[PDB]
Amino acid sequence: GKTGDTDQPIHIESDQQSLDMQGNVVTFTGNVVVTQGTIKINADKVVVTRPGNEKGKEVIEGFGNPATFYQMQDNGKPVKGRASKMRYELQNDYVVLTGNAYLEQLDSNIKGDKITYLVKEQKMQAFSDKGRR
């Protein structure tokens, strides 16, 4: 990769936290820190869970009524965004945003209410549904 991706973790100081022993669902509440690598998140509620027999295939969501995300993007095209929920996946590109979802980068800005983004990158997509599921 580069170097630093296992010196700086996701760090979480917290008040109203819980950590399960069995499936290992985790939740933080009321006051929560979230920073990692070159990224910051702000939230009142944070959750992390593991669809993982293998590791780093963990999934995280953050809620700040609205939550916000901030990224010093590698290539000199930094980005930040805001939504009722924000989401990330720990072996993966993908961020997703829902409820009043807004993002702005050197490449583009978008308002919508259901938007996906790629942390390695400068590209975004909105998914205007009509029962397509």
Binding site: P9, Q17, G37, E58
Partner: peptide, 16 residues
Amino acid sequence: VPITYVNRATXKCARY
């Protein structure tokens, strides 16, 4: 990246 969280009731930490 790893996750590394700290609990109010011990002031000390774990990985995930």
